[PDB]
Each structure stands twice: as C-alpha cells, then as structure tokens.
Enzyme design. Structure first.
Site, PDB file in Angstrom:
ATOM      1  N   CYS B  63      -4.416  -2.670  -5.509  1.00 39.37           N
ATOM      2  CA  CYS B  63      -5.597  -1.805  -5.494  1.00 39.37           C
ATOM      3  C   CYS B  63      -6.857  -2.414  -4.897  1.00 39.37           C
ATOM      4  O   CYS B  63      -7.374  -3.402  -5.418  1.00 39.37           O
ATOM      5  CB  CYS B  63      -5.918  -1.352  -6.910  1.00 39.37           C
ATOM      6  SG  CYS B  63      -7.489  -0.506  -6.999  1.00 39.37           S
ATOM      7  N   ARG B  66     -10.747  -2.027  -7.104  1.00 37.58           N
ATOM      8  CA  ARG B  66     -10.962  -2.642  -8.416  1.00 37.58           C
ATOM      9  C   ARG B  66     -12.408  -2.966  -8.821  1.00 37.58           C
ATOM     10  O   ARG B  66     -12.669  -3.324  -9.963  1.00 37.58           O
ATOM     11  CB  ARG B  66     -10.095  -3.896  -8.540  1.00 37.58           C
ATOM     12  CG  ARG B  66      -8.643  -3.587  -8.821  1.00 37.58           C
ATOM     13  CD  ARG B  66      -7.805  -4.840  -8.945  1.00 37.58           C
ATOM     14  NE  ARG B  66      -7.575  -5.502  -7.663  1.00 37.58           N
ATOM     15  CZ  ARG B  66      -6.978  -6.684  -7.539  1.00 37.58           C
ATOM     16  NH1 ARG B  66      -6.561  -7.326  -8.621  1.00 37.58           N
ATOM     17  NH2 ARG B  66      -6.792  -7.227  -6.343  1.00 37.58           N
ATOM     18  N   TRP B 226     -10.544   8.000  -6.529  1.00 32.69           N
ATOM     19  CA  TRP B 226     -10.860   8.914  -5.442  1.00 32.69           C
ATOM     20  C   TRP B 226     -10.184   8.296  -4.232  1.00 32.69           C
ATOM     21  O   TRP B 226      -9.762   7.137  -4.275  1.00 32.69           O
ATOM     22  CB  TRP B 226     -12.380   9.061  -5.238  1.00 32.69           C
ATOM     23  CG  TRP B 226     -13.135   7.767  -5.182  1.00 32.69           C
ATOM     24  CD1 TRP B 226     -13.176   6.878  -4.142  1.00 32.69           C
ATOM     25  CD2 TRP B 226     -13.915   7.186  -6.236  1.00 32.69           C
ATOM     26  NE1 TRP B 226     -13.931   5.776  -4.486  1.00 32.69           N
ATOM     27  CE2 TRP B 226     -14.394   5.937  -5.765  1.00 32.69           C
ATOM     28  CE3 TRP B 226     -14.252   7.597  -7.537  1.00 32.69           C
ATOM     29  CZ2 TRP B 226     -15.191   5.096  -6.551  1.00 32.69           C
ATOM     30  CZ3 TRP B 226     -15.045   6.757  -8.317  1.00 32.69           C
ATOM     31  CH2 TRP B 226     -15.505   5.520  -7.818  1.00 32.69           C
ATOM     32  N   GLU B 231      -5.668   6.649   3.622  1.00 35.91           N
ATOM     33  CA  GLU B 231      -4.505   7.115   2.869  1.00 35.91           C
ATOM     34  C   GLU B 231      -4.060   8.479   3.410  1.00 35.91           C
ATOM     35  O   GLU B 231      -2.870   8.775   3.505  1.00 35.91           O
ATOM     36  CB  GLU B 231      -4.856   7.229   1.382  1.00 35.91           C
ATOM     37  CG  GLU B 231      -5.273   5.917   0.748  1.00 35.91           C
ATOM     38  CD  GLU B 231      -5.439   6.036  -0.747  1.00 35.91           C
ATOM     39  OE1 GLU B 231      -4.440   6.354  -1.425  1.00 35.91           O
ATOM     40  OE2 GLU B 231      -6.569   5.818  -1.242  1.00 35.91           O
TER      41      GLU B 231
HETATM   42  C1  HEM Z   1     -11.935   4.565  -8.288  1.00 36.14           C
HETATM   43  C2  HEM Z   1     -11.326   4.609  -6.891  1.00 36.14           C
HETATM   44  C3  HEM Z   1     -10.177   3.929  -6.444  1.00 36.14           C
HETATM   45  C4  HEM Z   1      -9.921   3.616  -5.122  1.00 36.14           C
HETATM   46  C5  HEM Z   1     -10.839   3.936  -3.931  1.00 36.14           C
HETATM   47  C6  HEM Z   1      -8.608   2.974  -5.064  1.00 36.14           C
HETATM   48  C7  HEM Z   1      -7.910   2.764  -3.882  1.00 36.14           C
HETATM   49  C8  HEM Z   1      -6.549   2.440  -3.832  1.00 36.14           C
HETATM   50  C9  HEM Z   1      -5.772   2.309  -2.615  1.00 36.14           C
HETATM   51  C10 HEM Z   1      -6.302   2.517  -1.196  1.00 36.14           C
HETATM   52  C11 HEM Z   1      -4.474   2.029  -2.958  1.00 36.14           C
HETATM   53  C12 HEM Z   1      -3.279   1.980  -2.019  1.00 36.14           C
HETATM   54  C13 HEM Z   1      -2.617   3.355  -1.952  1.00 36.14           C
HETATM   55  C14 HEM Z   1      -1.439   3.393  -1.002  1.00 36.14           C
HETATM   56  O1  HEM Z   1      -1.615   3.021   0.184  1.00 36.14           O
HETATM   57  O2  HEM Z   1      -0.340   3.800  -1.443  1.00 36.14           O
HETATM   58  C15 HEM Z   1      -4.456   1.966  -4.381  1.00 36.14           C
HETATM   59  C16 HEM Z   1      -3.343   1.558  -5.071  1.00 36.14           C
HETATM   60  C17 HEM Z   1      -3.339   1.347  -6.445  1.00 36.14           C
HETATM   61  N1  HEM Z   1      -4.431   1.578  -7.304  1.00 36.14           N
HETATM   62 FE1  HEM Z   1      -6.325   2.032  -6.833  1.00 36.14          FE
HETATM   63  N2  HEM Z   1      -8.054   2.854  -6.333  1.00 36.14           N
HETATM   64  C18 HEM Z   1      -8.983   3.485  -7.192  1.00 36.14           C
HETATM   65  C19 HEM Z   1      -8.725   3.772  -8.541  1.00 36.14           C
HETATM   66  C20 HEM Z   1      -7.611   3.361  -9.253  1.00 36.14           C
HETATM   67  C21 HEM Z   1      -7.465   3.473 -10.703  1.00 36.14           C
HETATM   68  C22 HEM Z   1      -8.403   4.164 -11.674  1.00 36.14           C
HETATM   69  C23 HEM Z   1      -6.346   2.767 -11.037  1.00 36.14           C
HETATM   70  C24 HEM Z   1      -5.856   2.377 -12.299  1.00 36.14           C
HETATM   71  C25 HEM Z   1      -6.035   3.063 -13.649  1.00 36.14           C
HETATM   72  C26 HEM Z   1      -5.765   2.301  -9.803  1.00 36.14           C
HETATM   73  C27 HEM Z   1      -4.503   1.722  -9.740  1.00 36.14           C
HETATM   74  C28 HEM Z   1      -3.878   1.398  -8.573  1.00 36.14           C
HETATM   75  C29 HEM Z   1      -2.499   0.950  -8.501  1.00 36.14           C
HETATM   76  C30 HEM Z   1      -1.595   0.538  -9.659  1.00 36.14           C
HETATM   77  C31 HEM Z   1      -2.139   0.973  -7.190  1.00 36.14           C
HETATM   78  C32 HEM Z   1      -0.731   0.825  -6.611  1.00 36.14           C
HETATM   79  C33 HEM Z   1       0.010   2.135  -6.714  1.00 36.14           C
HETATM   80  C34 HEM Z   1       1.291   2.146  -5.921  1.00 36.14           C
HETATM   81  O3  HEM Z   1       2.108   1.220  -6.097  1.00 36.14           O
HETATM   82  O4  HEM Z   1       1.480   3.088  -5.124  1.00 36.14           O
HETATM   83  N3  HEM Z   1      -6.572   2.611  -8.706  1.00 36.14           N
HETATM   84  N4  HEM Z   1      -5.734   2.213  -4.940  1.00 36.14           N
END
Ligand code: HEM
Ligand SMILES: NC(=O)c1ccc[n+]([C@@H]2O[C@H](COP(=O)([O-])OP(=O)(O)OC[C@H]3O[C@@H](n4cnc5c(N)ncnc54)[C@H](O)[C@@H]3O)[C@@H](O)[C@H]2O)c1
Ligand SMILES: NC(=O)c1ccc[n+]([C@@H]2O[C@H](COP(=O)([O-])OP(=O)(O)OC[C@H]3O[C@@H](n4cnc5c(N)ncnc54)[C@H](O)[C@@H]3O)[C@@H](O)[C@H]2O)c1
Ligand code: HEM
Ligand SMILES: OC[C@H]1O[C@@](CO)(O[C@H]2O[C@H](CO)[C@@H](O)[C@H](O)[C@H]2O)[C@@H](O)[C@@H]1O
Ligand SMILES: OC[C@H]1O[C@@](CO)(O[C@H]2O[C@H](CO)[C@@H](O)[C@H](O)[C@H]2O)[C@@H](O)[C@@H]1O
Lengths: 346, 347
Positions: B63, B66, B226, B231
C-alpha cells in the site's frame, strides 16, 4: 571447488554443443591436470567465446538477450604491453561503433596479472560540481588527480583510466573523432535543440567481473546498443543524474509541472521520442522500450525451444516508461543467477 | 499456545506503542491467557480492535497510501448475526465511506467465527461477461447469474453483494442506485473520449482479504480508501486482461498510428489518466495522482522514523505503472517482511 565449477561449465557447454561424452571426459582430464600443475585452468578459445555468450544469456537484468549469440568476442588474454592494450581498446570502440550500426563486442583480457580499467564505461561524460554527470564525479576526481583536464562542459568525454601490472595508474584520451555522439532534438519542439543535449552512441560497461566456470576475468569491457529509457529517463531525468525535467518541460512549452497537470509525464514521453528519433537521424542504432520487450518475448520463445528456462530480475526487465505495455511486466521471473555470468566488483 | 504467543506479541507491541505501564500489559495478558484455556480463543478489546486494524493497514507492504493509516475509521460489527442488520451495516459503510465524494477510509469488522460471509472481490465491481464487462469479474458474475441476478448486460453493470449467513443459502443483494457513486470519464481536450461512455465507481472497497490481529483471524472485514489515478487509467482500462481499451482510447485521442517508435501508446496512456483524474475532480470525488501519492509516502516514512519504527514494503507494487522514476520509492529497495497485524489473501 574450482574443478567443481569447471566441470559444471564444461558439461553444459559440450552438451549444448552435442559433443561425445568421450571428448568431454578428455577435456575434464586435461583441466584437472593443470589445476594441480598450476592452481587454475585455461579455457580453450572455443570455451571463452561460448562462455561469454552464455554469461550474457544468464544476465537476468538484461532485456536485450535475444541477440546473445550475436556477440563478437575478442581474446586479449595475451595483451600485456601498454601499446597493444590501448590499441585493443580503440579497436573495440571502432569496431563496435560500425558506422552507426552497432555490433555486440566483448574484449576479454588476462584473468591474472592483466590490464586494470577504472572507468565505469569506456565512454562517459565527466561529472563536476556545477555541471556534468553526477554519477561520474568519483571517476572524474581521479582523472583530474592524474593530471587530466577537460573542457569543463556538460559533456566532456572522460579519458580511459587504466593501470598495467607493476606500473602506476595512467589515463589516455580518445581522439574526439573516435567517439560518436548524438545531438538531441525534437522535430516538434524547436526549443529542445537549444539545450544542446547529446549522448554517446556506444554503452561499453567496463566495471564488472566476467565469470566462466570458476575463472574470474576482472577486465572484459562489453557493449550493446541503447534502449531509449536509459538515456531519456534515467541519464537525463533522474534527479541524481542530469536532472533536466524542468529545462526540458520549458522546451516543450508546458506552462506548469504540477502533478495534477500530468505534464511531468508528458515531458518524459516527449523526451524519449526526441532521443529515439535523434539517434535514428544520426544513423545510430537504438531500440524503443516496447519493441525491446517484444524482442525479449522471442528470446524466451527461442530458449524454451532449446529446452532452457528463462531467469531474470523483474524490476530491471520492466521499463521506466509505460511498463504495463510490456509482457514481462505481468508475471514474475526466477532471479536465479547461473554461471557463466557478469557480476559487480566487490 | 501458539495463539497465545501471537496474542502476546500483538499486545506487547501495541501497548508498548501506547506507552502503557508494564502492570497494565501483564494484567491484560492474564485475562487473554485465561479465556483461551476456557474457550479456545480470546476476544479483542474494542480498543485493540481499532488499533489492531490501523496497525494492519500500517504494515501493508503493498500500500502506497499508508500516510493515512492513523485516520482509519473502524466499525465493530462482531455482533451482527442476522441478515437485515448485515445488509444495513453494508450500505452504512458504503454511505459513510463515499461521504458524497469526500471519501473517508473505513473498515467494518464482522464476527471472526460464525459471521456473515462475503463472496465479492470488492463490495463494488463491474460485471464480467464473455463479450464485454470486466474479465476479472467473470467468476463472481457467473455466481451472481446462477443465484438469479440479471444485469442490463453492459460494460458497466454494478454487481450485487453476494453473501451467506450461517446455516443459510447464498443470496445476492442489489445496492440502491443512489448508493453507488460513479464517474463518467471524459477528456477536456478530446471530445471523442466521452463518446466511449466510460466510467468507474468512486470507492474501492476490498472484501476478499483476511484481517489478522494477534492470532485472531477476521475473514469478513471489508476496507476502503480512495483511488490513485493509475489503478483505473492504466490497469483497469488498459490491461489486455481487463477492459483492454488502448486502441479505442487512442482513436478518441486521434492518434494516426500506435507503432512503437511513434510513442503514441505512451501518450495515449498519459492522456487517459489525465482524463480519469480530472473526471473524478469534476464530479467531486476524491482521487490522488500517482506522483502525489508517492510524495505522501515519503511523509509516511518520515513520520515512521520519528516513531522508532522501520518501514517495510513490496517495491514492484509501490512503484506506479506510470512514470515510476518520478517517485522516490523507485530508487531503492524495500524490506518485504510481513509483520502482524496485517491483511492476507484468502487461501
Ligand atoms: C486512503 C487511501 C488509500 C490509497 C490512495 C491507497 C492506495 C493503494 C494502492 C495504489 C494499492 C495498489 C492497488 C493495486 O494496484 O492493486 C493499494 C493496495 C493495498 N492497500 Fe491501500 N490505499 C489506501 C487505503 C487503504 C486502506 C484503508 C487499507 C487498509 C485498511 C489499505 C490496504 C491495502 C492493501 C492490503 C493493499 C494490497 C491489496 C492487494 O493485494 O490487492 N489501503 N492501496
Ligand atoms: N496491482 C497489481 O496487480 C500489481 C502491481 C505491481 C506489480 N505486480 C506484480 O508484481 C510482480 C513482481 O514480482 P516481484 O519481483 O516482486 O517478485 P514475487 O512476486 O515473486 O515476490 C509481477 O509479477 C507483477 O505482475 C502486481
Ligand atoms: N539502475 C537500473 O537500471 C534499475 C532499473 C530498475 C530497478 N532498479 C532498482 O531495483 C531495486 C528494486 O528491486 P527489488 O526491491 O524488487 O529487489 P532487490 O533484489 O533490489 O532487493 C530498486 O533499488 C531500484 O532502484 C534499478
Ligand atoms: C545488443 C543490445 C543490448 C540491449 C538493447 C541491452 C539492453 C539492456 C538494458 C536496457 C539494460 C538496463 C541498464 C540499466 O538501465 O541499468 C541492460 C543491462 C544489462 N545488460 Fe544488456 N543489452 C544489450 C547488450 C548487452 C551485452 C552485449 C551484454 C553482455 C556481453 C549485456 C549485459 C547486460 C548486463 C550484465 C546488464 C546488467 C548490468 C548492471 O548490473 O548494471 N547487454 N541491458
Ligand atoms: O517468462 C519466464 C518466467 O515465467 C515464470 C513465471 O513463474 O515461469 C514460467 O516460464 C518458465 C520458463 O522460463 C517455465 O519453466 C515455468 O514453468 C513457467 O511457469 C518464471 O519462473 C520465469 O522466470
Ligand atoms: O525506505 C525504506 C527501505 O529502505 C531500506 C533500504 O532500501 O532501509 C534503509 O532505509 C530506511 C529508511 O526508511 C532505514 O530505516 C533502514 O535502516 C535503512 O537500512 C529498506 O530496508 C527499507 O524497506
């Protein structure tokens, strides 16, 4: 342990050469001998040529392995005098440049008591305090310390920095006529030429170790031809390199570079478009990031057909421009490093 | 016993972070040790659940967003066991999350044992058919259809929630239209792009991962944030195993050719993300561009250093699929150690 690595190499080479088990054994016999007589063994010229081609073929971080068998290997294990060494370096640069149509070349020197080279690449631009290539600062201070003095511009070709056994470090300047350079221009943005950017034609790595079945060759410069993003993204745009994003964005007339505008992204595409076509205009070989990947697929096909699996380092094979538009981006690679191969110096 | 080990590591890491006296920690560990012997597992203190979820997001190596972990809105729904309340809690999450465009990070944690079961990959996803739609949602769409669900058959049919409460058949539920905020994609400089009738939903809510906190596995705990421009503008729209819209989009941008050395493929990509980004902006939906998101990640690393914590990560995922060298994270490696609590793919 030496004989072990040696054996592995001989087996693979000969099996791939369809050699009778018979001769393979004779060769292992001869080797086991001089390892005892000497301490190491000597590769036949066929093994040296084949070993270097294999080393390129195992180069995980190399996207251009489709042409591995095209390598032009030069045995220079006998070069021990300054004149012949220098002569071999200039010969390599001259034959590699081939009037624009670059040719894969590697000049292998003596594994022991051989000519040492201090350059990162046989051809690089100096790096100063207020200009030049920041990545070459170290090698440039050494040059200066040795007595070398460049014009002090943004593109001063560094001299060859070498040292023969039982002698002091020296430097040799290439005549400018020997180094082919490419002025960068954009046929749609006249102001780009005004920046007076340019780059050399042939990338000759001269700071890695070649390893063939146990033997380590500390000096064996090799070359291929560029892939746009090397020059257009990393060399020119990396902040720790020429860091030209702002000046180039101006040449492209982008009123702003706010991340929201996506102009930073457009500037990158345009700059690589200019680099590519500038090289094309100078008749100097170059391949674009996407075509380079298509050729890589073929390499993978050609390897599977020969019963060999493909190893590679994902993060390197993927280009720093529209990476998802390449096949290799979408799956992983086995980063297992096999022998023969190229390694960094300790 | 193995459970207690993990509970202890969590409790200690957490309470240490909250500066809780040693006596407080030891008392808590006792209670936990006690109820494991009497019931098999233990129950998380509401505070532990809230902070545990935030540590899970903070430990997520993949992520890039973070920097905002601290602001996660945690909803405890371990008490939900009936259908009507389950659905209500879902629309609630979606409602609160969307927040009329000012997206807010939320996570609803349901019961760790004998709770609602969810089959969707994301609470909101477009249907995937044999001749259109999102190829990625084929399996889930097959299931929806088998259950009696039937969409208009377009490229953007919002799939229905598919759930199952203990000792009950698998059912599907369609969200009210008003509930799902969507964004039409258009490019100011290219009127032909509108003619493609493209769009995407506002909230990305992952509902196919396990949340693990101190040995306790929470299988149903959907979370959201968001979007980050690439993506949608790169993966979702351009991957050949997704919508595969490069050729079509190129035409909308009026590119005479897409031969590699023309670099139009790359211009097409940059232009489509420009469109997606400002389209969201025009509709008032939160979105961050790839470069800005990477800058925020730099801040995250600065804050984490000031807290005595090291940063872990998965390089390939942190680097965006567009101009990756313009992000600081591209220029060095990342320790991909997976710490607890954390999120995991369902086996
Ligand atoms: C608040 C805005 C947030 C942004 C801008 C953000 C952005 C991202 C991005 C760009 C990815 C990669 C997605 C992909 O290419 O498949 C991602 C993956 C991830 N994010 Fe965040 N994130 C946010 C919030 C969250 C929240 C709230 C959580 C946790 C409660 C979180 C958990 C994760 C996890 C576990 C992954 C990996 C998921 C997977 O394996 O497909 N993210 N996030
Ligand atoms: N969001 C995504 O789906 C996404 C984003 C970036 C990279 N990746 C994948 O990550 C992998 C990179 O592998 P790695 O070297 O980290 O090794 P690894 O996956 O073997 O660990 C690629 O196979 C690529 O397809 C997936
Ligand atoms: N100089 C180059 O040509 C180049 C190209 C791509 C990636 N990289 C580097 O590769 C590393 C990413 O590797 P990783 O963390 O997947 O694994 P790792 O083996 O570098 O650790 C980064 O440090 C990055 O800067 C370098
Ligand atoms: C024929 C043209 C060739 C092309 C287009 C090609 C392209 C590339 C590219 C794009 C890189 C990445 C460089 C970077 O960004 O750091 C690279 C790395 C590499 N290539 Fe090739 N290559 C070619 C020829 C060669 C040859 C002839 C050899 C071997 C004898 C070779 C050995 C390697 C090695 C060892 C690396 C990794 C070097 C490092 O660690 O920095 N390549 N190549
Ligand atoms: O493209 C090569 C790359 O793909 C991976 C993905 O795991 O493996 C596939 O290709 C190999 C050939 O090199 C096969 O041996 C393997 O069975 C297949 O899945 C990587 O391991 C490999 O580096
Ligand atoms: O940026 C995090 C990432 O950096 C690495 C090396 O690339 O670790 C170095 O930088 C960290 C700064 O955030 C230091 O905490 C760490 O001690 C230092 O070695 C990775 O290990 C880490 O994932």
């Amino acid at each position: 342990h030496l004989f072990k690595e040696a054996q592995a190499f001989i087996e693979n080479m000969y099996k791939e050469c369809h050699y009778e088990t018979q001769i393979i054994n004779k060769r292992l016999h001869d080797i086991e001998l001089e390892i005892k007589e000497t301490g190491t063994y000597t590769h036949t010229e066929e093994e040296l040529i084949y070993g270097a081609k294999m080393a390129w073929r195992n180069s995980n971080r190399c996207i251009g392995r489709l042409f591995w068998d095209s390598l032009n290997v030069i045995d220079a294990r006998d070069v021990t005098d300054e004149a012949s060494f220098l002569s071999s370096i200039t010969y390599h640069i001259t034959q590699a440049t081939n009037e624009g149509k670059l040719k894969p070349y590697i000049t292998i020197y003596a594994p022991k008591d051989g000519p040492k080279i201090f350059n990162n690449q046989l051809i690089r631009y100096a790096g100063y305090d207020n200009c030049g290539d920041p990545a070459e600062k170290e090698v440039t201070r050494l040059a200066n310390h040795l007595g070398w003095k460049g014009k002090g511009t943004n593109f001063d070709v560094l001299p060859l920095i070498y040292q023969l056994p039982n002698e002091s470090v020296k430097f040799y300047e290439y005549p400018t006529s020997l180094i082919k350079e490419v002025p960068i221009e954009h046929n749609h943005y006249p102001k780009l030429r005004k920046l007076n950017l340019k780059w050399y034609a042939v990338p000759i790595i001269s700071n890695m170790d070649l390893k063939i079945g146990g033997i380590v060759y500390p000096t064996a410069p090799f070359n291929g031809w560029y892939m746009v993003t090397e020059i257009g993204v990393r060399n020119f745009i990396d902040d720790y390199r020429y860091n030209l994003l702002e000046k180039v964005a101006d040449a492209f007339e982008f009123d702003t570079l706010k991340n929201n505008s996506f102009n930073k992204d457009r500037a990158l595409v345009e700059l690589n478009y200019a680099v590519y076509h500038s090289f094309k205009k100078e008749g100097v070989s170059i391949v674009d990031h996407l075509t380079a990947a298509k050729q890589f697929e073929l390499f993978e096909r050609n390897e599977a057909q020969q019963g060999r699996q493909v190893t590679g380092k994902w993060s390197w094979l993927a280009p720093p421009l529209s990476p998802t538009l390449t096949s290799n981006y979408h799956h992983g690679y086995d980063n297992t490093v096999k022998d023969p191969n190229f390694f960094y110096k300790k």
